[PDB]
């Protein structure tokens, strides 16, 4: 996350971090329930084997709330392709259930119609992660969050050098220097409604980070709600 603020105690409890063989975070994820994590399909090519860490806000210390979970089943969307990043979505079933506590809680899955008319018409959403704080830099050791405006669909197509499919949406800023960045992929895009946070996107891609005339591109979660449901039932 470039710009934004530190996630303070209990503020981003749905954050998951995919960690590789060397306990390094490489992607984000969203806690959907005690057994399931939502992430980006393209994150599944970035590590041979990985585990999922929850309850972590600072990778340098032991805050006492952290918990590592091994993956039992990786459910990648079959239609995902590296060419366009269309269908950039995957669900992970964990071996053992997550124990919810301070800093560890699931984000809500909304219903499609209501989410599209009421959540995605809100002014902003919130993106979070342990990704880079500048386009060139190292991964952040602190969990960060950023309020990102929903971007008019037409404006987003115009700004993009690549095709914005119907399974994608755009959020962030034209020139203001705030955006998701490397390592944030797979992470939560949530939208607040009356103090309840609903999952609305997955950090997917961007032409660099926080560039002028460019926006953050996110998987449109509302387009995959039935798929997520099927994926969780088995």
């Amino acid at each position: 996350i470039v710009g934004g603020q530190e996630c303070k105690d209990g503020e981003c409890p749905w954050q998951a971090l995919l960690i590789n063989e060397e306990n390094e975070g490489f992607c984000g994820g969203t806690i959907l329930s005690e057994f399931y994590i939502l992430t980006a399909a393209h994150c599944l090519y970035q590590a041979k084997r990985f585990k999922v860490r929850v309850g972590d806000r600072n990778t340098e210390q032991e805050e006492g709330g952290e918990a590592v979970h091994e993956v039992e089943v990786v459910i990648k969307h079959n239609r995902f392709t590296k060419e366009t990043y269309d269908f950039d979505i995957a669900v992970l079933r964990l071996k053992t259930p997550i124990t919810f506590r301070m800093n560890v809680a699931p984000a809500c899955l909304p219903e499609r119609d209501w989410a599209e008319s009421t959540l995605m018409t809100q002014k902003t959403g919130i993106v979070s992660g342990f990704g880079r704080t500048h386009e060139k830099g190292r991964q952040s050791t602190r969990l960060k969050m950023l309020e990102v405006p929903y971007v008019d669909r037409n404006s987003c197509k115009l700004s993009s050098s690549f095709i914005i499919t119907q399974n994608m949406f755009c959020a962030g800023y034209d020139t203001k220097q705030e955006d998701a960045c490397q390592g944030d992929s797979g992470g939560p895009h949530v939208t607040r409604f009356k103090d309840t946070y609903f999952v609305t996107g997955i950090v997917s891609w961007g032409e660099g980070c926080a560039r002028k005339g460019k926006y953050g591109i996110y998987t449109k979660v509302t387009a995959f709600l039935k798929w997520i449901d099927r994926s969780m039932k088995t």
């Binding site: 503020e11 560890v104 699931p106």
Partner: protein, 52 residues
Amino acid sequence: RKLCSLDNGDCDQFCHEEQNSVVCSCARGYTLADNGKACIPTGPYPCGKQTL
């Protein structure tokens, strides 16, 4: 603006228009309150709530 377009139909969460009438519902882990509008957490750590 009417029904669900009018302040989310006064619902806490999901708003549907069944017939010419507002019908509210809630995400998993919440039960719809007696007033048929508010969403009540069924147990600890309901989805979408920041902790403490």
